[PDB]
């Protein structure tokens, strides 16, 4: 009920919705086009239809939905491919047969006809429950056993618990009665994209993300729930780091939100991710897509869907966190989201603030980044999840003066600062150790101390060595390496070795494809010990360069030492190399 | 130094905390006595204003 | 020892904060008890029948005047529903006396729960768009906020 | 007393657009009347009426307009301006942006309701500041001092430790003492901070033992953007009550003054108003004036409010509208240098722009030394000449620094090395630091000094 009255491009004004709420999705016309309610002037409303508005005829019925923009969560969310407006692209292609996305597709986000093996918990049938309780668990797949939980903001006395059996999503398995009424609950549930998932208490981040690359893991640690920004726009290095995170990182699952990027890049991602596979500690091979939910939005897609795709992905990540799993969310291009925001702002005619961006860009961006952190879950049993965002910055022109870049830098904790110059310098990691900074170093105090008490001192010395190296570069360019003091010359040589072997991880070779924390820490310890015991020894620079060349070769062999040779074996080899370097440096002097 | 420091520290802070708790309990008791004294006066004043109505 | 005695200082600070916040919690609990006693006494006054009628008529008249509407829809509790039905157009006549005007239409029926309604009148306007809600329970907790500074003054020791 | 009236309840919302909710058929509206909107779902949120026209009333809600229906939401007119329940018990607790308690404690029992945005001080009654402050940092008390009633902010771009500096100042704050009941009662506003920074603030303030005398007003970025503007207001209202009507001196701290500005720009753009520079509202000078121009010493009362805000140059540019307006109003500035931070200096204060307009009265015979003004002038002027010498050396060469230029460069280097640097908890007293300040001044010849007369420093004696 409700008929269109003024259809002017994207905006459609329809009478009859006296009871429509602000920001409530509504279906327009026979084609069931989807639009949001903005202005509720009088008895009429205002619908910004996301899809094309051509062909609409006046008095075409408008159907209210009684729900803001919401994503249907639950089992089976993983693996599939979804658009910005939560549309399952693969099932749409299968059912429709045709290649194009039809104008007015109504395929549900999750196929409710598929059967999942539902296994209930031992909770009593006459017990009492509240929001967030892990009342059951469903085996949506392998490696991602879906710990279904009672919907948040729902508390009641349970009446009936379904047994362990194969059930559909449409089938109901739960019912509760706090008051006189009893309301049944299904496995599928919904949540608005905007409002964050309820959380009992945000927690201080304590444990780091292991990216599998030595440079990020060692120099600039990132906590669980720590925001990270990548300045990547060309060369697909950001996609490389995303693939590394998907394959090796600590994230129990990963969500990649690709919005507003070129269609070819999206196609490349959609073929590349299935090819990748993640090795278990058991060693048998399991595909990453089974643990990965991918959301893609091309430029052809409607702008509003592109803007809301970010909140869709972050809400999926929030569901996973509330399910008690550490999860990482990767934004392909925050700058593309900013472009979508400026387009929407121009469509709605807001007052520009800085370079065309709407004023509220800072607030929306800050909110989205702030929706990620280590969290104490709602309900019981008490478990802790974490959402860490590695959203990528893609400044146009490579200038930090871009308002989105400045806002992100103000908000982001860790900025890994990938540089195209390092790629031009034949560096595979391409991580600029200088322009990048870590703000979570203090957070790693307990973890680093437990793992290795001297690791903090090693990291500080490495940072000091990098600073001394960047100074000594221009110092050498001034007069030459010879004019430098013997200890300064050793420092420069050790910094060069550090950059060549430790900092630069090829990741193309099988031995360097994954660098564990133990191997990286041991390599750093060997390098720092060699540098130290060489610096005290001076004896001459050239003389010790020749007589300690074996020590340098042994230190470089730490890079040759790999987890592929075995973690205990790699640790033993690193210890032996450190001892050999110590003996060579001490005995010679 | 460390032995004399630990000997001094072991007990004084706990005694001070206990004394503070006792003083807080005493103050709570005094406040409760005052509230009991003023309860009916406050209630009567509130009832008067609620009941008092004109125009 | 210097970097450890900060722990003792923090312990002292935490103890002091806990003690003072417990004291303030006790004060607020006393205030809540005062509010509950006031509500119970308001219900006891509502138990009155004869003198309790005049205040209802006064409320109806004053609500009609402040609303200044041409037609209203009044709803009352089942208790004193006979009393307000007896008041009837006496309130309208009093309103016409306060300002020379033709008395509006008065309609009375559904009732809230006795203790919940606690008397009072919801005069409202046509179509329920505008509501002048004057329950004694609602009139209270409005007086309470205004008189809270006076109460804090009263609580000396 | 005049008979009370229960607040009217309306349902005539006749249009919603942006952050504004329109009403009609309102019987006797009031400007800036606080309204508490209850939605159809039963949840409640507040807001202010921005314009009153006829029976129409245009309201800007606080929590946002999402989820509001034209035929089920109810608006209630409290018929009063926004009021914060100020009381003496508010010390040692924390509050949300709107002032709701978040310290797991009972709501404040008010001594008396005070309408925020209170009237100004009669300038006949305002009096000048005449008392220095022992903040706990050397370089502030030695040069570019602070007076008990003087406002002065901290200029610091993004990524700088200015928040840690503010925490150190708040924990190390104290009177010169050259008592405790009337001592500094610090109010710590937090306009738009990150959750991690908020946890840092809470932990640092709780552990320091300053919770006996410190009130926090935390407002995270997740909070509604409008709730951000009312924060550094409520904070100043509580400060006024505690200082003037309660007596104890207050050292208000505002963080992210820029976030307040952003909050204004966003609200102004929502209101579709006339834009000043860079899209900021044209009246922001007024609306900062209403925040800054409160600290001072009213005569009739022994209290005192001292304002130490913290700004953030957005593009690291002092010419941005927010620092421009601040430097217009705020009576001086303390400047933090990014280059010094790169040089690994924990208090990276750049003294070249760090000036205190009221320092001429902070100095005197009651405190400091008779050569304080001259030493400050010399260490403020010769630093610029040393920087010019460094620039000339860079653009020509090492031999360019003559026998006089080399002295200036050495003075600049030693100044950046010894004087400026300080410990993370260094309460370096004024005389010990002024000794090495005169040592730096004496690195240059004791007769080449032009501005200072030699007799002024001759009053002081080395060793």
Q: What DSSP letter does each residue of A550-572 carry, written as one string?
A: HHHHHHHHHHH--GGG-HHHHHH
> Crossing angle, helix B2-51 and helix C143-154, to 10 degrees?
130
Tell me which of B12, B26, B30, B35 to substitute to probe the interface with C (most C C-beta atoms closer than 10 Å): B35
Cβ <8 Å between B39 and C34: yes
Q: Which residues pair with D10 in a beta bridge?
A: C130, D75
Question: Which is it for strands D94-95 and D214-220: parallel, antiparallel or unpaired?
Answer: parallel
* Largest interatomic CA distance in chain C: 86
Cβ <8 Å between D209 and C9: yes
Q: Annotated binding residue at A136?
A: no
Sign of the C-alpha dihedral computed for residues D98, D104, D109 and D111 taken in this order: negative
Experimental determination technique: cryo-EM
Residues 173-232 in A contacting D (C-alpha not used; CB under 8 Å): 194, 202, 204-205
**SS3 (DSSP) at A82:** strand
Q: How far apart are CA A578 and CA C117, in angstroms?
A: 83
Let me know: does A116 contact A75? Beta carbons within 8 Å: yes
Which residue in the block uniquely carries the two structure tokens 């994230």?
Answer: A251
* Largest interatomic CA distance in chain A: 94
Helix then strand then coil, % of chain A, to nearest 5: 40, 20, 40
Let me know: does C77 contact C114? Beta carbons within 8 Å: yes
Let me know: does A199 contact A387? Beta carbons within 8 Å: no
**Chain C residues lying within 8 Å of B32, measured CB to CB:** 26, 30
DSSP string, C15-64: HHHHHHHHHHHHHHHHHHHHHHHHHHHHHHHHT--SHHHHHHHHHHHHHH
Q: Would you put residue A331 in left (φ > 0), alpha (ψ -120 to 50) or beta?
A: beta
Let me know: does A47 contact A32? Beta carbons within 8 Å: no
- Determine contact: D272 vs chain A, CB below 8 A: yes
Let me know: does A261 contact A333? Beta carbons within 8 Å: yes
DSSP 8-state symbol, D42: S
DSSP 8-state symbol, A290: G
Calculate ∠ Cα D270-D272-D274, nearest 5°. Answer: 130
Q: Which residue of D has its CA nearest to B54?
A: D3
Q: How far apart are CA D91 and CA D385, in angstroms?
A: 48
Beta-carbon contacts of D388 under 8 Å, excluding residues fewer than 6 positions away, are: D408
Q: How far apart are CA A329 and CA D75, in angstroms?
A: 40
Calculate ∠ Cα D79-C117-C92, nearest 5°. Answer: 70
Residues 36-75 in C contacting B (C-alpha not used; CB under 8 Å): 37-38, 41-42, 45, 55, 58-59, 61-62, 65
Calculate the alpha carbon distances from A267 to A259, A336, C41, D48 in Å.
Answer: 13, 17, 74, 50
**Chain C residues lying within 8 Å of B48, measured CB to CB:** none
Let me know: does C26 contact D106? Beta carbons within 8 Å: no
Calculate the alpha carbon distances from A459 to A323, A491, C108 in Å.
Answer: 35, 15, 80
CB atoms within 10 A of CB D153: 23
Instruction: Give me the helices (H) in D10-119, please.
Output: none
Instruction: Give me the helices (H) in A373-511, please.
Output: 403-411, 420-424, 445-451, 455-478, 486-497
Q: Which residue of D has its CA nearest to B50?
A: D4
**Chain D residues lying within 8 Å of C67, measured CB to CB:** 27
Write out D325-366 in H/E/C secondary structure. HHHHHCCEEEEECHHHHHCCCCCCECCCCCEECCHHHHCCCC
Calculate the alpha carbon distances from A299 to A303, A307, D164 in Å.
Answer: 8, 11, 43
Encoded tokens for A8:
């002017």
| Residue in A354, A363, A409 nearest the CB of D279 | A354
> CA nearest D38: which of D47, D30, D29?
D47
DSSP 8-state symbol, A234: S
- Determine contact: C149 vs chain D, CB below 8 A: yes
In this structure, chain A runs to a length of 589
| Residue in C13, C28, C139 nearest the CB of D211 | C13
**Chain B residues lying within 8 Å of D3, measured CB to CB:** 52-55
Let me know: does A61 contact A50? Beta carbons within 8 Å: no
The kind and range of the H/E element at D430 are helix D430-443
Let me know: does A452 contact A425? Beta carbons within 8 Å: no
Q: Which residues pair with D280 in a beta bridge?
A: none
Calculate ∠ Cα A432-A437-A439, nearest 5°. Answer: 155
Cβ <8 Å between A68 and D67: yes
Q: Do chains A and C touch (3 or more CB pairs under 8 A)?
A: no
**SS3 (DSSP) at A516:** coil
> CA nearest A305: which of A270, A328, A336, A273?
A336
Sign of the C-alpha dihedral computed for residues C156, D4, D10 and D16 taken in this order: negative
Question: Which is it for strands A70-73 and A189-192: parallel, antiparallel or unpaired?
Answer: antiparallel
The kind and range of the H/E element at A318 are helix A303-322
Residues 46-65 in C contacting D (C-alpha not used; CB under 8 Å): 62
Peptide bond into A381 cis (omega under 30): yes
Question: Which is it for strands A292-298 and A253-261: parallel, antiparallel or unpaired?
Answer: parallel
Q: How far apart are CA C29 and CA C25, in angstroms?
A: 6
- Determine contact: B51 vs chain D, CB below 8 A: no
Helices then strands, counting H and E runs in chain D, come out as 13, 21
Question: Which is it for strands D8-10 and C130-131: parallel, antiparallel or unpaired?
Answer: antiparallel
Q: How far apart are CA D140 and CA D136, in angstroms?
A: 9
Q: How far apart are CA A245 and CA A250, in angstroms?
A: 8
The burial of D127, by beta-carbon neighbours within 10 Å (0-12 exposed, 13-18 middle, 19 or more buried), is given as middle
**Chain D residues lying within 8 Å of B55, measured CB to CB:** 3
Calculate the alpha carbon distances from A71 to A68, A537, B6, D420, D427 in Å.
Answer: 10, 65, 59, 55, 56
* C-alpha distance from D39 to closest chain C C-alpha (Å): 15
Q: Annotated binding residue at A487?
A: no
Q: How far apart are CA A477 and CA A481, in angstroms?
A: 8
Q: Annotated binding residue at A20?
A: no
* C-alpha distance from B10 to closest chain D C-alpha (Å): 20
- Determine contact: C6 vs chain D, CB below 8 A: yes
CB atoms within 10 A of CB D349: 26
**Chain A residues lying within 8 Å of D161, measured CB to CB:** none
Question: What resolution, expressed in A, was reported for this entry?
Answer: 4.2
Let me know: does A210 contact A217? Beta carbons within 8 Å: yes
Q: How far apart are CA A130 and CA A138, in angstroms?
A: 19
Q: How far apart are CA A438 and CA D432, in angstroms?
A: 37
Cβ <8 Å between D158 and A19: no
Q: How far apart are CA A148 and CA A133, in angstroms?
A: 9
Cβ <8 Å between D16 and A39: yes
| Residue in D17, D221, D262 nearest the CB of A367 | D221
> CA nearest D378: which of D291, D319, D442?
D442
Cβ <8 Å between C149 and D110: yes
Encoded tokens for D434:
């002024």
């Amino acid at each position: 009920y409700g008929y269109v009255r003024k259809v002017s491009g994207p905006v459609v004004i329809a009478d009859g919705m006296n009871g429509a709420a602000m920001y409530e999705l509504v279906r327009v016309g026979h084609d069931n086009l989807i639009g949001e309610i903005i202005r509720l002037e009088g008895d009429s409303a205002t619908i910004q239809v996301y899809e094309e508005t051509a062909g609409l005829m006046v008095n075409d019925p408008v159907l209210r939905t009684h729900k803001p923009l919401s994503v249907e969560l639950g089992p089976g969310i993983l693996g599939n491919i979804f658009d910005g407006i939560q549309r399952p692209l693969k099932t749409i292609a299968i059912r429709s047969g045709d290649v194009y996305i039809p104008r007015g597709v109504s395929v549900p986000a999750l196929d409710k006809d598929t059967l999942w093996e539902f296994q209930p918990k031992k909770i009593g049938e006459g017990d009492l429950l509240t929001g967030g309780d892990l009342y059951a668990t469903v085996f949506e797949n392998s490696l991602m056993q879906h710990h279904v939980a009672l919907p948040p903001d729902a508390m009641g006395k349970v009446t009936y618990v379904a047994p362990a059996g194969q059930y559909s999503l449409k089938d109901t398995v739960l019912e509760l009665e706090f008051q006189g009424v009893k309301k049944s609950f299904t496995m599928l549930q919904a949540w608005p994209v905007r409002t964050p998932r309820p959380v009992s208490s945000k927690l201080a981040a304590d444990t780091p993300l292991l990216t599998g690359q030595r440079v990020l893991d060692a120099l600039f640690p990132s906590v669980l729930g720590g925001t990270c920004a990548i300045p990547g726009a060309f060369g697909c290095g950001k996609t490389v780091i995303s693939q590394a995170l998907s394959k090796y990182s600590n994230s129990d699952t990963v969500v990649y939100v690709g919005c507003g990027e070129r269609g070819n890049e999206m196609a490349e991602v959609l073929m590349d991710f299935p090819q990748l596979t993640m090795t278990l500690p058991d060693g048998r091979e399991e595909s990453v897509m089974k643990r990965t939910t991918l959301v893609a939005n091309t430029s052809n897609m409607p702008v509003a869907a592109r803007e809301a795709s970010i909140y869709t992905g972050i809400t999926i990540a929030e569901y996973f966190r509330d399910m008690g799993y550490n999860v990482s969310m990767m934004a392909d291009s925050t700058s593309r989201w900013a472009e979508a925001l400026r387009e929407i702002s121009g469509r709605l005619a807001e007052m520009p603030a800085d370079s065309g961006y709407p004023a509220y860009l800072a607030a929306r961006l800050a909110s989205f980044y702030e929706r990620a952190g280590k969290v104490k879950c709602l309900g019981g049993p008490e478990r802790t999840g974490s959402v860490t965002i590695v959203g990528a910055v893609s400044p146009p022109g490579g200038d930090f003066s871009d308002p989105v870049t400045s806002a992100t830098l103000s908000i982001v904790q860790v900025f890994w600062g990938l540089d195209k110059k390092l790629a031009q310098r034949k560096h595979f990691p391409s991580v600029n150790w200088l322009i990048s900074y870590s703000k979570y170093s203090t957070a790693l105090e307990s973890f680093y101390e437990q793992f290795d008490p001297d690791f903090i001192n090693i990291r500080t010395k490495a940072r000091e060595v990098l600073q001394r190296e960047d100074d000594l570069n221009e110092i050498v360019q001034l007069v030459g390496k010879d004019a430098l003091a013997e200890g300064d010359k050793i420092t420069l040589e050790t910094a060069k070795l550090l950059r060549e072997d430790y900092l630069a991880q090829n990741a193309f070779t099988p031995y360097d494809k994954f660098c564990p924390f133990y191997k990286s820490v041991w390599m750093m310890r060997n390098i720092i010990h060699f540098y130290n015991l060489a610096n005290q020894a001076v004896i001459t620079y050239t003389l010790i360069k020749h007589r300690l060349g074996d020590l340098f070769y042994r230190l470089v062999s730490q890079k040759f030492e790999d987890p592929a040779e075995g973690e205990p074996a790699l640790v033993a080899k690193f210890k032996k190399l450190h001892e050999d370097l110590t003996a060579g440096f001490r005995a010679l002097e | 130094e460390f032995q004399r420091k630990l000997a001094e520290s072991s007990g004084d802070s706990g005694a001070n905390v206990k004394r503070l708790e006792q003083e807080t309990e005493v103050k709570i008791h005094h406040l409760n006595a005052g509230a009991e004294k003023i309860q009916y006066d406050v209630v009567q004043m509130l009832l008067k204003h609620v009941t008092t109505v004109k125009n | 020892e210097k970097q450890v005695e900060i722990r003792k200082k923090i312990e002292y600070s935490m103890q002091l904060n806990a003690s003072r916040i417990k004291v303030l919690q006790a004060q607020d609990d006393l205030v809540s008890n005062m509010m509950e006693a006031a509500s119970k006494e308001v219900l006891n006054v509502s138990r009155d029948h004869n003198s309790y009628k005049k205040l209802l008529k006064g409320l109806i008249v004053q609500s009609l005047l402040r609303l200044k509407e041409p037609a209203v829809l009044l709803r009352c509790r089942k208790d004193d529903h006979h009393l307000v039905e007896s008041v009837l157009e006496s309130a309208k006549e009093e309103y016409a006396q306060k300002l020379q005007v033709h008395p509006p239409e008065i309609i009375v029926h559904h009732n809230a729960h006795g203790p919940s309604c606690s008397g009072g009148v919801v005069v409202a306007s046509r179509d329920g768009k505008i509501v002048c809600e004057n329950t004694l329970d609602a009139r209270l907790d409005v007086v309470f906020r205004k008189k809270l500074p006076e109460i804090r003054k009263q609580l000396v020791s | 007393e005049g008979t009370l009236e229960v607040a009217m309840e309306y349902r005539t919302v006749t249009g919603v657009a942006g952050p504004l909710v329109i009403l009609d058929k309102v019987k006797g509206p009031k400007y800036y009347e606080i309204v508490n909107i209850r939605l159809g779902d039963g949840t409640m949120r507040r807001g202010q009426v921005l314009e009153v026209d006829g029976e129409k009333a245009v309201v800007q809600v606080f929590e946002g307009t999402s989820g509001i229906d034209n035929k089920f939401t109810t608006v209630q007119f409290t018929g009063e301006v926004l009021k914060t329940p100020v009381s003496l018990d508010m010390l040692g607790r924390i509050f949300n942006g709107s002032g709701k308690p978040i310290d797991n404690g009972p709501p404040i029992l008010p001594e008396a309701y005070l309408d925020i945005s209170g009237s100004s001080i009669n300038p006949s009654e305002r009096t000048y500041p005449e008392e220095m402050i022992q903040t706990g940092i050397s370089t502030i008390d030695v040069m570019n001092s602070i007076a008990r009633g003087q406002k002065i902010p901290l200029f610091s771009a993004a990524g700088l430790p200015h928040n840690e500096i503010a925490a150190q100042i708040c924990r190390q704050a104290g009177l010169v003492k050259r008592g405790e009941e009337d001592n500094f009662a610090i109010v710590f506003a937090a306009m738009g901070v990150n959750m991690e920074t908020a946890q840092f603030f809470k932990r640092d303030f709780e552990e320091n033992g300053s919770m006996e005398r410190v009130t926090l007003f935390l407002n995270l970025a997740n909070d509604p953007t409008i709730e951000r503007i009312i924060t550094p207001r409520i904070a100043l209202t509580t400060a006024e009550y505690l200082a003037y009507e309660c007596g104890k001196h207050v050292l208000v701290i505002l963080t992210d003054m820029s976030s307040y500005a952003d909050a204004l720009r966003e609200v102004s753009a929502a209101r579709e108003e006339v834009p000043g520079r860079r899209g900021y509202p044209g009246y922001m000078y007024t609306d900062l004036a209403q925040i800054y121009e409160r600290a001072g010493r009213i005569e009739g009362r022994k209290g005192s409010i001292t304002q130490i805000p913290i700004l953030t140059m957005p593009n690291d540019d002092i010419t941005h509208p927010t620092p421009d307006l601040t430097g217009y109003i705020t009576e001086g500035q303390i400047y933090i240098d990014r280059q010094l931070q790169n040089r690994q200096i924990y208090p990276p204060i750049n003294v070249l722009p760090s000036l205190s307009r009221l320092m001429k009265s902070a100095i005197g015979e009651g405190m400091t030394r008779r050569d304080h003004s001259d030493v400050s002038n010399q260490l403020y002027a010769n630093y610029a000449i040393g920087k010019d010498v460094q620039a000339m050396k860079a653009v020509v060469g090492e031999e360019a620094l003559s026998s006089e230029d080399l002295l200036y460069l050495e003075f600049l280097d030693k100044f950046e090395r010894k004087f400026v640097a300080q410990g993370a908890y260094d309460s370096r007293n004024i005389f010990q630091s002024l000794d090495l300040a005169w040592t730096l001044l004496r690195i240059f010849p004791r007769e080449l000094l032009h501005r200072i007369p030699g007799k002024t420093l001759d009053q002081y004696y080395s060793r």
